[PDB]
């Protein structure tokens, strides 16, 4: 639904890198690079965003 | 230009991605839909004949043209307004549109004067609408459209909304109609037994089956012996087996020559001419066409009172009952002897040995009744009540002589009740006629996952009864290849019973033989009637829907003509079988529904017609108009039904099966467009699906059903019952292509886990897991369980009425230790208040004839916060109210959770961060699976899925796991995961974390997609210590949400009494169930009465009040003893 | 209150010729087939105008107070 | 609820959603039936094959066998930690097996810790070779595949499923026969509770490399089913040139399947051994075979060797379609492919007809696990 | 062997025999038709029934294309070395695993077995 | 297996005994056929001995044959036929009270026409009826009759289908029954407890 | 609205109603075992 706060398995925070992650890739980065540009080194924080889904985004199309 | 194997991969998923972006997934269902409404609808009105009164004045009505309007719903002060799902869920309103239909009355007053009015659009009734169908209102809007209307786009529509209740029509398997088959019976009397269910064209009245039986040999006598097997038949309407040559008589071919010319094409075939001898001494004493149409009316449906009706009665057998799919006409009995002669001929093939015995397993002979053609059944039966009724109406006012109003003639209720009667039940047919109404064809929608939605609409269901035992309908037969997904099935009582459409396949909707027919006709086809007999064996027979329409001479020009008309889509649509059994010399045609089909890319000359610019093409899919309907015209791919595949040499993949190599088949006629496409729904999420054990496919495809997610875009809309949502769903990080069409990226259903497979400390032992505590303080696989409850306040009766108040325990009689205190002044909880166990949220009060309380308490597990509470007026006009309560599952001890690879398992314990093992980076696992799930399952597919995930978040690309695909290899995952820096095959050097040593042994580990399955402890943990008991038995309730016991049965009671443990049985079984005492008279063992507050007891009967026993028993014992009074047995306890 | 005889299966269902010989029989009151009637007859008015069941089922009540009331035993039951 | 491993054999049970009822019994008469009757302890050897009903499963199984291997050397430390979890130990450390130049305590010296008693016992490892009884060193075992347990120490020998599963003979089976239910139960938990936290040392997994084979191991097992290819085309031309006598008893179609599955069935026994001997003492499938915690030689051939063959109702896929078994052969292809042998291993992957194939024969199990719940559930209740 | 139909009303004949000529006759029976027997077998009982299945192969067989083609046995009659090969799969064989072949040239349906 | 051999009576009347033929729930005597009525098997019954009754394997004083013949039909108490309410004070009546329905109406029927006097085809359909009533009572799964159903297509449950079966009377409530002080839930392993300990949750305890 | 005897839930034959007591025996739903009525039919039938 929305980017995780933190990473599930270290606890470091990814909730703040969503918007810079989505970013990047419009930049014509790959995704490795992206991961890389925004210091997620271990693989448990590259999944956290490799493999997010936002949905919220979605949910913001229903009218309140 | 031709697409060379380097560039396969892409194109062959270029195809399938436009296949999807056309049909998308629920094709069957909105196809089947929308030919009902289209065509069937109007074609029962038109076939109906018109209604004819006179009793003098006559008068005539006809119905000419049917007309539907949107979705509809009327307000109570009448007005009426477009009906939206959203509401018909909400409301409880059932999505239904109005059918209007005009109507001539022409009258005729005996004045030679006729007087002729129409009654443009009459109402006669609702007919629920499929939802996203061409009726529908959200048909052909727009993506943002929908979600104005709060309709999730994703959402595939095929379904009914019936009461507000989502409601799928399973498709039902039958075997195929008006095509002969032979079957071998061991055990009956018959040898062989051929069958044919005969139908009228556009389904008319049910189907008729004629059976033509070859007596067994196994009655023994001289006569019998001697003269072999005769053949005999079962004519529909007819007590008793009618000899074979008997009916022929009766058609009107006499001498034994014209019989046999029909029977037999080819008289130089002495072995076949033989096996019919015996048949023609049985009906020799028969020698006339009007003795054996007496013969036959002897044995009809009512005694004939004299000869002439008995002929008249078994002429109209013959004429209409027998073969109606031949003909239903009086000048067709030339053609029923030429079908019934080919039934003969072919039984005679059958027990000659000259063609094997049909198989009742093949799909071929199987048809699927989708919607529209379930729907048009029933329809067929509310139209001819709606005229039964307007007749009968229109016949009491046109006796007294005064003109009747056509519009009070129509009874509206009885299609818009009939339809959604069955739609709501799902019972099948009528409701007064249950007893033989199929059940279980409607169910509501599975709303788990959207998974589970999808797979719920491309649903197959068995003929066979579930409660019946048979392992070959069971089986997975080699024709469901590419038709149904050889995978998803589900485990126990329904294994193999209940199946899933594969991922391409598609089940025709049917069209009209005609244009085949006439085509035949101008080409150099002979009709049937035409021909002489003779000419009958050199030549094919040419049958179209299993009517033999002719013969044809040069078989392979005309297939050749008719697969060229086909694929140019000239006067053969694309769902249209050409079948041609040459050694059989038989061309079948089909143009019916419910034929499975599946798209094949054609192949000539070792050549697939689908070339480089094609794919190009398609690229460019939108802004060119190009679409998968292109491919089809274009004749490079044409679909193929299961019977077509028969006669299909069928190419895996052109990039090697077509090369030139060693000389295995050099005539190949199609190719698949990719092998993964025999795979359903559910099974197209498994990665690495041919690295498993096939089980373990079956188990996953039943795992994902139950998966957490986001089942739908609009959940918070909605207001389902059960609803589960996960926090933070990812999409895998091991993929399949087959995925991307799913939409499961959209709406996931499971988290990546950092998955350890080790034996940590003995609590993932036997398919338990360890979870990591501090992944799941952080949200890991955390879900929200919404649950809807539903009141209305109804007022029925001359003073009884229900409100919604708050019961004040003085007020209202009926009440309960829960609290009250929530309600508000509405009787209805607020959103956002915590409600715990023995919590009312609906304070409903009846007027007691001061007033009772039935007010809704809170389930006593559930402890969550009201989200929302809707109110409304439902479909019936009364108050209505749903109020959703919101309960956050953090995953617990107990909780199940499952890899896509069959690999389910409870959490045993759950681990803080230090306490996991850790590597060396301090990557944690969030899951750690013992390794003794691995040897025994075998589901490699699991361990790569974990090393390409590996591979993946390293890389920063999503792994394709797609089943059949040679460019991935484990060793080129390992090769890939060198490069960043860990272990080739995906271990690593963890360290103990109580300890911070390093185990010995290198753990197996990386991300691997898990899924937290419906299952929660919580809501199945249930004590019972003296609850209440039921009525009927003074026993323990049954069910958790009655706080019932357990029950201890036979197998219980069998294993105390090994054990030996006397008392603890009778605790069980007598004290701790239901204790009672009972008076017994001494004299007689009868139960005598008892008073106990007087302290007299008597048995009436024996006269006597001095001499009775109390007796300590069950109250079931007491009440069989009771029960066996009532069948006048007399269980006498007697203590002596 | 009352149970209705099923369709006949087996042979000894049926009489010597033909027809069942365990037929249903109406025991329905006057009183109340007649009150059975204006309830179908109130339902059918109602889905010709759309009105929810909840006015029927005011009808219905209504009904059954005029029908046993009795001042309007003179008046046809469809008025 | 909370069980005990020990107790799922007995129960049938496991812990992928299973659930089993409680009774609470509500009496002291009751409940003293229960206590002196049916408490799980006076369970532990059933009498209907006179033979412990639960024994040590999974894991401890696994690393039992690891712990008693003759390798296996504890520091003064761990060795500590491991008698922390023994409640029946007497508080005095046995003198190491090795005291110079470190002191060492072998994994054997501290199981002869949780033996109860002085029980006596012979048995053998899974591994333990056939011709060994006769050689030169028949009571010095080279492999350590002989179990002596003499009064009540555990002297040499690795413990398996053999020497602490559910069999007759085995040492729990001796412990009960010998020391009685209460000591027989202390057993059962001291070696889980003992193990299960050396395993925590030693540790225990399973993944992609156990499932990997040398290249050598794999163009043997490729030119075996390369070879079985050939057997079976050279009957199918036999029997195409009828130059196949029928075996006396057997009709020439039944001649011929004998044949081709004769063929296909050594191929698979072939290629399984060929990846059984490729397989290092350290692979963890190998580890969890030969201790009999889970799996089979044949699970461990199927993951690195070859599925086999395919078979629906005891003979190979049948020609549901005419004369073939699928769309993609030619007709009367009788073949090993064509008829459901798989070549590949599940970690090669299976092929689009060896998978559908494969499916197929699932598919039977499946039916027959629905069927025999029911069909022997009647049976039961009418001996009962 | 063969079967016979009258003349007169064309239904089945059956054999007879008659004292005075002693001469097998085909009378039928609604019609009392007779005829002279030339044949003198009333019907032969093939157990074995070793049918020479080259005559129920069909030429066409040919244009199927499924059956497997081999050119390693050229058509005797017209020496084409394309041929279709397959089994018989006719019941009531109790065995059968032999080759039929049928030549593939068009207007040479010739067949074989080996 | 004796008398069915015998076919004529030796003892007096010296006659031929009928073949006796069952027709569903009714009994034809053919020597020439005859409707075998209840009232006549009755009164045959009636004057059956009491040393004769012992013979045919009946004991006098617990069964006598005409016993087998309902005169008078027991009625189950209310707690045998409880009504259920559901959805409201409207009482659902049993199927067993359903029954005693009809055969409460056909036999006041059945009386008048007897008291009115009314044809004896009349009363011979009402007696038919009376006979499958009574009949569907007890076993409402007779072969090859109709069945009776619940005026919406459920056949209704009589007296011997309540007893018959795995959730039968006897099975379902004797041999097995729900009981208290029992409880269920998920099972997940601990190593840390005894093979003779189970781990419950306090909610449970 | 009231339960009447010689009907079919004579309320001598039970208390099926919570709120309710049985004439016969004076006993309570839980109290009362029940009692069997009975019908007297015009003509004997078979017991099938
Ligand atoms: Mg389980
Ligand atoms: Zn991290
Ligand atoms: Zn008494
Ligand atoms: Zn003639
Ligand atoms: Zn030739
Ligand atoms: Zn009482």
């Not at chain 2, 009201?866 to 209505?880: A, I, P, S």
């Not at chain 2, 302290?1095 to 109390?1110: A, D």
């Not at chain 6, 049993?94 to 055969?103: G, V």
Request: hydrophobic share 35%; net charge neutral; with cysteine.
């Amino acid at each position: 639904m929305i980017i995780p706060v933190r990473c599930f398995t270290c606890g470091k925070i990814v909730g703040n890198k969503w918007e810079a992650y989505l970013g990047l890739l419009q930049a014509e980065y790959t995704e490795g690079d992206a991961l890389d540009a925004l210091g997620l080194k271990r693989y448990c924080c590259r999944r956290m965003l490799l493999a997010h889904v936002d949905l919220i985004e979605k949910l913001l199309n229903y009218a309140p | 230009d031709e697409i060379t194997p380097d560039l396969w991969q892409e194109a062959c998923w270029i195809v399938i991605s436009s296949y999807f972006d056309e049909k998308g997934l629920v094709r069957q269902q909105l196809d089947s839909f929308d030919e009902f409404i289209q065509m069937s609808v109007q074609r029962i009105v038109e076939d109906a004949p018109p209604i004819d009164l006179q009793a003098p004045p006559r008068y005539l009505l006809k119905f000419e043209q049917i007309y539907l309007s949107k979705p509809t719903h009327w307000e109570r002060d009448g007005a009426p307004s477009p009906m939206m799902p959203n509401e018909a869920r909400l409301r409880n309103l059932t999505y239904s549109a109005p059918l209007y239909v005009d109507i001539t009355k022409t009258v005729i007053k005996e004045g030679e004067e006729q007087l002729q009015t129409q009654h443009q659009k009459t109402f006669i009734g609702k007919i629920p609408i499929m939802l996203r169908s061409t009726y529908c209102l959200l048909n052909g809007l727009t993506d943002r459209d929908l979600c104005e209307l709060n309709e999730c786009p994703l959402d595939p529509g095929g379904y009914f909304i019936i009461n507000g209740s989502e409601k799928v029509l399973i498709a039902q398997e039958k075997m195929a109609t008006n095509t002969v088959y032979v079957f071998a019976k061991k055990d009956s009397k018959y040898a062989y037994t051929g069958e044919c269910r005969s139908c009228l064209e556009n389904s008319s009245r049910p189907t008729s089956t004629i059976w033509v039986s070859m007596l067994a040999r196994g009655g023994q006598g001289a006569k019998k012996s001697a003269i072999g097997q005769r053949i005999v038949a079962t004519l529909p309407y007819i007590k008793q087996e009618v000899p074979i040559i008997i009916v022929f008589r009766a058609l009107g071919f006499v001498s034994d020559r014209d019989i046999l010319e029909h029977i037999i094409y080819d008289f130089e075939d002495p072995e076949m001419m033989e096996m019919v001898k015996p048949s023609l001494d049985e009906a020799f004493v028969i020698q006339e066409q009007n003795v054996a149409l007496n013969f036959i009316g002897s044995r009809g449906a009512k005694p004939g009172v004299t000869k002439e009706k008995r002929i008249k009665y078994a002429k109209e057998v013959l004429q209409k009952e027998m073969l109606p799919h031949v003909g239903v006409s009086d000048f067709c009995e030339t053609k029923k002897a030429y079908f019934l002669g080919y039934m003969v001929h072919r039984l005679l093939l059958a027990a000659l040995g000259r063609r094997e015995l049909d198989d009742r397993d093949h799909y071929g002979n199987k048809r699927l009744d989708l919607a529209g053609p379930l729907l048009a059944f029933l329809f067929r039966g509310m139209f001819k009540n709606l005229l039964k009724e307007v007749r009968i109406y229109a016949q009491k006012f046109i006796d007294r002589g005064k003109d009747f109003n056509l519009e009070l003639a129509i009874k509206t209720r009885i299609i818009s009740d009939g339809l959604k009667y069955s739609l709501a039940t799902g019972n099948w047919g009528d409701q007064k006629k249950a007893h033989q109404a199929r059940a279980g064809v409607s169910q509501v929608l599975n709303r788990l996952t959207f998974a589970s939605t999808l797979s719920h609409l491309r649903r197959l269901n068995s003929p066979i009864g579930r409660d019946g035992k048979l392992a070959k309908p069971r089986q997975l037969h080699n024709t469901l290849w590419g038709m149904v997904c050889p995978a998803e099935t589900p485990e126990g009582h329904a294994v193999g019973l209940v199946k899933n459409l594969a991922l391409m396949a598609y089940i025709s909707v049917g069209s009209q033989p005609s244009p085949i027919l006439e085509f035949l006709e101008e080409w150099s086809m002979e009709n049937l009637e035409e021909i002489s007999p003779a000419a009958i064996a050199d030549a094919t027979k040419i049958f179209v829907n299993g009517c033999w329409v002719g013969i044809h001479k040069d078989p392979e020009q005309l297939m050749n003509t008719l697969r060229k008309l086909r694929r140019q889509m000239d006067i053969i649509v694309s769902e249209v079988s050409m079948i041609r059994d040459i050694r059989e010399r038989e061309i079948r045609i089909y143009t019916d529904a419910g034929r499975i089909c599946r798209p094949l890319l054609i192949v000539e000359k070792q050549k697939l017609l689908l070339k480089k610019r094609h794919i190009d093409q398609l690229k460019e899919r939108e802004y060119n108009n190009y679409s998968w309907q292109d491919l089809v015209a274009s004749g490079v791919v044409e679909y193929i039904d299961t019977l077509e595949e028969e006669t299909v040499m069928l190419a895996m993949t052109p990039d090697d099966l077509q090369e030139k190599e060693v000389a295995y088949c050099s005539t190949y006629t199609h190719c698949e467009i990719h092998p993964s496409m025999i795979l359903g729904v559910c099974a197209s999420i498994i990665p690495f699906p041919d690295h498993n054990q096939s089980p373990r496919n079956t188990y996953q495809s039943a795992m994902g059903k139950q998966a957490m997610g986001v089942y739908i875009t609009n959940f918070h809309v909605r207001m389902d019952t059960l609803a589960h949502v996960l926090y933070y769903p990812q999409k895998p990080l091991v993929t399949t292509r087959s995925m991307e069409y799913l939409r499961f990226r959209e709406l996931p259903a499971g988290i990546n886990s950092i998955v350890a497979i080790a034996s940590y400390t003995g609590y993932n032992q036997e398919d338990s897991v360890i979870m990591n505590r501090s992944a799941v303080d952080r949200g890991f696989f955390r879900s929200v369980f919404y649950r809807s409850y539903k009141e209305q306040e109804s007022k029925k009766g001359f003073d009884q009425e229900e409100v919604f108040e708050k019961p004040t325990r003085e007020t209202c009689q009926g009440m309960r230790h829960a609290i009250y205190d929530k309600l508000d002044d509405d009787g209805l909880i607020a959103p956002g208040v915590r409600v715990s166990g023995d919590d009312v949220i609906i304070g409903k009060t009846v007027t007691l004839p001061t007033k009772r309380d039935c007010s809704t308490f809170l389930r006593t597990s559930e402890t969550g916060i009201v989200d929302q509470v809707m109110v409304t007026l439902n479909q019936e006009g009364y108050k209505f109210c749903k109020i959703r309560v919101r309960s956050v599952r953090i995953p617990q001890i107990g909780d199940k959770f499952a890899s896509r690879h069959g690999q389910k398992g409870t959490c045993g314990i759950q681990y803080r961060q230090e306490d996991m093992p850790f590597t060396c980076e301090g990557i944690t696992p969030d899951i750690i699976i013992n390794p003794h799930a691995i040897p025994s399952r075998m589901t490699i597919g699991h361990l790569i899925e974990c090393l390409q995930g590996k591979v993946s978040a390293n890389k920063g690309e999503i792994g394709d796991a797609t089943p059949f695909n040679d460019a991935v290899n484990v060793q080129k995952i390992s090769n890939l995961l060198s490069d960043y820096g860990y272990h080739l095959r995906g271990n690593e050097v963890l360290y103990n974390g109580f300890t911070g040593r390093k185990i010995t042994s290198q753990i197996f580990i990386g991300p691997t997609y898990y899924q937290r399955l419906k299952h929660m402890v919580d809501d199945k943990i249930h004590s019972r210590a003296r609850g209440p008991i039921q009525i009927l038995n003074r026993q323990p309730m049954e069910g958790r949400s009655r706080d019932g016991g357990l029950r201890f049965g036979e197998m219980e009671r069998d294993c105390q009494i090994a054990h030996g443990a006397a008392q603890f049985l009778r605790e069980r079984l007598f004290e701790a169930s239901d204790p009672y005492q009972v008076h017994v008279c001494n004299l007689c063992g009868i139960m005598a009465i008892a008073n106990t507050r007087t302290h007299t007891y008597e048995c009436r009967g024996c006269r006597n009040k001095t001499q009775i026993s109390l007796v300590r028993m069950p109250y079931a014992c007491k009440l069989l003893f009771q029960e066996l009074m009532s069948m006048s047995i007399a269980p006498r306890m007697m203590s002596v | 209150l009352s149970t209705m005889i099923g369709k006949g299966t087996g042979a000894a269902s049926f009489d010597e010729f033909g027809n069942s010989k365990y037929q249903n029989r109406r025991t329905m009151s006057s009183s109340d087939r007649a009150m059975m009637n204006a309830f179908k007859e109130i339902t059918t008015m109602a889905d010709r105008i759309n009105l929810p069941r909840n006015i029927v089922d005011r009808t219905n009540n209504l009904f059954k107070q005029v029908y046993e009331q009795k001042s309007l035993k003179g008046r046809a039951n469809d008025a | 609820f909370r069980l005990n491993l020990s107790v799922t054999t007995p129960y049938n049970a496991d812990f992928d959603g299973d659930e089993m009822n409680l009774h609470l019994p509500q009496s002291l008469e009751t409940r003293a039936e229960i206590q002196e009757l049916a408490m799980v302890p006076r369970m532990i050897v059933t009498p209907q094959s006179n033979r412990p009903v639960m024994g040590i499963v999974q894991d401890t199984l696994t690393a039992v066998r690891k712990f008693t291997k003759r390798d296996v050397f504890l520091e003064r430390g761990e060795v500590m930690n491991l008698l922390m979890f023994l409640s029946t130990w007497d508080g005095k450390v046995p003198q190491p097996a090795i005291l110079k130049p470190r002191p060492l305590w072998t994994g054997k010296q501290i199981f002869s810790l949780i033996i109860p008693g002085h029980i006596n016992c012979i048995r053998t490892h899974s591994t333990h070779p056939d011709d060994e009884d006769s050689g030169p060193y028949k009571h010095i075992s080279p492999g350590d595949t002989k179990v002596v347990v003499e009064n009540g120490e555990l002297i040499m020998g690795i413990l398996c499923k053999k020497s602490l599963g559910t069999s007759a003979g085995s040492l729990v089976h001796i412990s009960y026969l010998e020391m009685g239910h209460d000591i027989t139960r202390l057993f059962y938990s001291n070696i889980q509770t003992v193990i299960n936290n050396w395993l925590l040392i030693e540790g225990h997994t399973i993944g992609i490399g156990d499932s990997i084979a040398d290249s050598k191991t794999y163009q043997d097992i490729q030119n075996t089913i390369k070879k079985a290819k050939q057997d079976v085309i050279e009957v199918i031309e036999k029997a195409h040139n009828n130059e196949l006598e029928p075996t006396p008893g057997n009709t020439l179609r039944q001649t011929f399947e004998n044949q081709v599955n004769r063929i296909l069935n050594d191929a698979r026994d072939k290629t399984g051994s060929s990846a059984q001997k490729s397989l290092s003492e350290y692979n963890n499938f190998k580890s969890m075979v030969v201790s009999g915690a889970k799996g089979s030689k044949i699970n461990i051939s199927q993951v690195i060797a070859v599925v086999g063959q395919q078979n629906v109702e005891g003979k190979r896929i049948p020609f549901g379609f005419k004369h073939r078994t699928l769309p993609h052969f030619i007709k009367d292809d009788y073949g090993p492919e064509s008829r459901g042998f798989v070549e590949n291993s599940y970690l090669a992957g299976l092929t689009p007809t060896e998978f559908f194939f494969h499916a197929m024969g699932g598919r039977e199990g499946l039916i027959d696990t629905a069927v025999k719940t029911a069909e022997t559930g009647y049976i039961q209740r009418r001996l009962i | 062997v063969g079967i016979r139909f009258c003349q007169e009303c064309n239904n089945m004949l059956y054999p007879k025999e008659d004292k005075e000529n002693r001469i097998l006759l085909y009378a039928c029976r609604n019609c009392d038709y007779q005829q002279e027997a030339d044949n003198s077998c009333i019907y032969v009982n093939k157990i074995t029934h070793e049918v020479d299945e080259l005559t129920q192969i069909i030429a066409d067989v040919s244009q199927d294309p499924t059956l497997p083609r081999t050119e390693d046995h050229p058509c005797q009659k017209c020496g084409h070395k394309e041929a279709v090969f397959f089994q018989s799969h006719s019941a009531r064989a109790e065995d059968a695993m032999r080759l039929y072949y049928v030549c593939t040239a068009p207007h040479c349906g010739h067949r074989w077995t080996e | 297996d004796l008398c069915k051999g015998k076919n004529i009576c030796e003892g007096g009347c010296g006659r031929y005994q009928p073949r006796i033929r069952r027709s569903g729930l009714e009994l034809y005597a053919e020597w020439k056929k005859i409707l075998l009525s209840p009232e006549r098997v009755h009164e045959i019954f009636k004057r059956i001995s009491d040393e004769e009754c012992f013979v045919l394997g009946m004991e006098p004083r617990y069964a006598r044959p005409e016993w087998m013949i309902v005169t008078v039909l027991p009625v189950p108490p209310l707690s045998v036929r409880p009504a259920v309410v559901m959805q409201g004070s409207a009482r659902n009546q049993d199927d067993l009270t359903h029954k005693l329905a009809d055969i409460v109406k056909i036999n006041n029927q059945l009386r008048r026409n007897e008291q009115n006097g009314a044809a004896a085809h009349v009363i011979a359909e009402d007696v038919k009826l009376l006979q499958f009533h009574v009949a569907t009572m007890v076993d409402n799964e007779l072969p090859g009759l109709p069945r009776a159903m619940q005026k919406s297509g459920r056949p209704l449950k009589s007296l011997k289908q309540r007893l018959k079966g795995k959730e039968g009377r006897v099975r379902g409530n004797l041999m097995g029954k729900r009981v208290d002080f029992s409880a269920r839930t998920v099972i997940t392993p601990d190593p840390n407890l005894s093979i003779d300990q189970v781990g419950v949750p306090r909610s449970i305890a | 609205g009231r339960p009447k005897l010689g009907g079919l839930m004579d309320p001598r034959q039970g208390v099926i109603e919570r709120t309710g007591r049985c004439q016969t025996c004076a006993g309570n739903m839980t109290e009362c075992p029940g009692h069997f009525g009975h019908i007297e039919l015009a003509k004997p039938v078979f017991h099938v």
